Design a protein around this ligand. Sequence first.
Ligand SMILES: [Zn+2]
Ligand SMILES: [Zn+2]
Ligand SMILES: [Zn+2]
Ligand SMILES: [Zn+2]
Ligand SMILES: [Zn+2]
Ligand SMILES: [Zn+2]
Lengths: 425, 426
Amino acid sequence: FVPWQLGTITRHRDELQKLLAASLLPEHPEESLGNPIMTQIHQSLQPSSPCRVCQLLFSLVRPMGFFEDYACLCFFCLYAPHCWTSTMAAAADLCEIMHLHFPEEEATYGLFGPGRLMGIDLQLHFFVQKCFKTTAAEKILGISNLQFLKSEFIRGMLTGTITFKTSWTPCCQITDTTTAPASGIPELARATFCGASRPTKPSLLPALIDIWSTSSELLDPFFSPPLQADTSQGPCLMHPTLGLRYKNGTASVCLLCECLAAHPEAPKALQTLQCEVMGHIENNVKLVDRIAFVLDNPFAMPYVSDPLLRELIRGCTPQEIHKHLFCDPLCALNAKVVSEDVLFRLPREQEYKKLRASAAAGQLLDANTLFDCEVVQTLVFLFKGLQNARVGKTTSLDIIRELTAQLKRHRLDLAHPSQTSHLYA
Amino acid sequence: FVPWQLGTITRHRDELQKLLAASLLPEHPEESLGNPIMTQIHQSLQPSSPCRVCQLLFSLVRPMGFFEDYACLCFFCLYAPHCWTSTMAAAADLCEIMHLHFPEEEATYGLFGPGRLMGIDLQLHFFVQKCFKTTAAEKILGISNLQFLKSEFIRGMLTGTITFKTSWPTPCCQITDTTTAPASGIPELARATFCGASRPTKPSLLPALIDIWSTSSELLDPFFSPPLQADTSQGPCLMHPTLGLRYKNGTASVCLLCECLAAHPEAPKALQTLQCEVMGHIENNVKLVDRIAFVLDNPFAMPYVSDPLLRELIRGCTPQEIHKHLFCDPLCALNAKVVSEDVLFRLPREQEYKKLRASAAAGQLLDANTLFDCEVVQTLVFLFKGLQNARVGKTTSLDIIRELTAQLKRHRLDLAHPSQTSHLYA
Ligand SMILES: [Zn+2]
Ligand SMILES: [Zn+2]
Ligand SMILES: [Zn+2]
Ligand SMILES: [Zn+2]
Ligand SMILES: [Zn+2]
Ligand SMILES: [Zn+2]
């Protein structure tokens, strides 16, 4: 069983349809007193609510093919960026794990939608809170403080306003002066996915473009949206920012972060683009002009094989590319955690079988070895929260002050977060 | 091809008139819902919009001496003050460079105006942001923070209010790197090319200044005819750093002595000699504005100035304009520190000039102005002019003033205290 397979998405087009419909915003929220979808998402974001996915799983465990297939999904999620595509894929792969190991269970059918799992529940379990990580007991209270803050500011993005200064061991491996520097993905994963030997799994770009052009205007039939649904903002309740807002030629749903999780050569295609932008021009041309100059060229970016991804990146505005490579802290967090090999290279069966054994034995899920820091993660969500919701000016500049300090402690070079918050969505 | 030539201005009177017309303010701005000129300038000042001049250039390369003629223009700007005249000259010399090396492409004609280039675009590219300086890649992010601040406060001067403490942050420049020697002058290649009494000077740009600004403004109390429905009391001020002409205490937001620094070959040394006369001749406690009046009442004043036009202009300025320029305004101080009258106005020796161009086209001479170059001090100067010409909160206004005073002392610039200056002058 392997995650991130476009085929798994098409197989469950029926169930996902229930998930995609349930992840759209109401067309006219002001004309109803409530809405059951928003009520449940809002409930998932209250700090003392149960985790609906953790509760589903415990329901099923009170085989062997199951702890080893589930631990694969967890490992893939741990090495995946935070975005819509990762939630879609984790949704599909959770269907498959449930249809594989539990075909007789009623929880397996009608898995998504109102009263069952929702997009936000996937986000919380696999990406925001990472319930699957193996963590020591003495780290539990500390983690809950940070999870509390994340829930509050994510809920703020849903409802529109916020209700830190009171609330705020080295935090991670980077700030750890003892540790040996990060090699890369752990050894067993490098053995299993790496090497010129490997063909690619199918790209998720077609599904992404279908769903989002059908149910939003992000890009100006797998998914059919209802009316009394907001077809201008897409299935954004599966995205970290919970909405689609436009500013300065950018949008709150970053398309290049979607590419990091939906296409096999996006991680490095962008890393080389960043290198071309910094290195080719040797004078004081500003970053959005450098991007226009690099991508003005008719052959632009030959290092990218798939002409579709090339067509997409060259179609982005210089502001979208500026925001993603140099400004937004969540884009920076997304780029540092992804492993394009784990996500998209077809695994070698001999090495994969030990990986499943090791992960289900609880050995590869303690931390993302490329980047893993709940402190920086939390501030990234706090920042996106002040960017997308009403927040007090004084806490707002408190977050900005601390995020900048941590960005430097962790060797992440961005424009100043206050500039980023002025410029972009 | 040599920049800063009155002749270059004269031949392109056609394109340059179109720039001056597009550089006046609306006559009655409140009676229209918008204005395409103001909308575009305001668009050029947003931090994530492209540089129109950079975009013109890349569109033109996507010859063998274009890169060297453009690099000469850049070198001159680097050693030119920030003012109307320097924007006019860069406009003219950009025309000339386009007719020499790109005469069949349509971009060259209709170079200026709505939908094309504007004064703000020339100012941003050649003077405020200096896109041509050779900068290391690892320093770009930091630079964009400072350019952000500059754009915002210049945009405030355009619209009237501002929309620092959040964004503000090794020596910053050669002045505060106290392990280096104190600056002596322009590079050797430039010294060889421009210096020596043997060298004849190019024509004074003062007539062009005096003509254009008297026909389309009141700054002085036909190259250019202004349209109707335009504010003919403020001149082509959208080519000037303050984006308007306002008056206070016998001064105006357009400083005439800064125009002279860029428009006339002996203004830099004349004013520095005047500064010595003002400081040194009186030996008792007479105020600076009276000392200025005493030096310039004498009928034989400033005999070190040969050109009687420059001499009469300086002597006609009010003691506040001269007080403001020599002792108070921080943008006037930066302008005096950056300018080289030799580069701008002495006829180059062609054998050494060929070496200059090769160096400048190879990027070696555009790393930094060796007389003064500090983007920190540049940014604070634009912040201060912004609080002076636009609505800014009291707490952030007094924050700029205190940081600017600290940097002024750290860079050995002796000015009156900026709070005094902000109270006194435009
Ligand atoms: Zn969970
Ligand atoms: Zn950390
Ligand atoms: Zn992104
Ligand atoms: Zn430029
Ligand atoms: Zn300095
Ligand atoms: Zn001046």
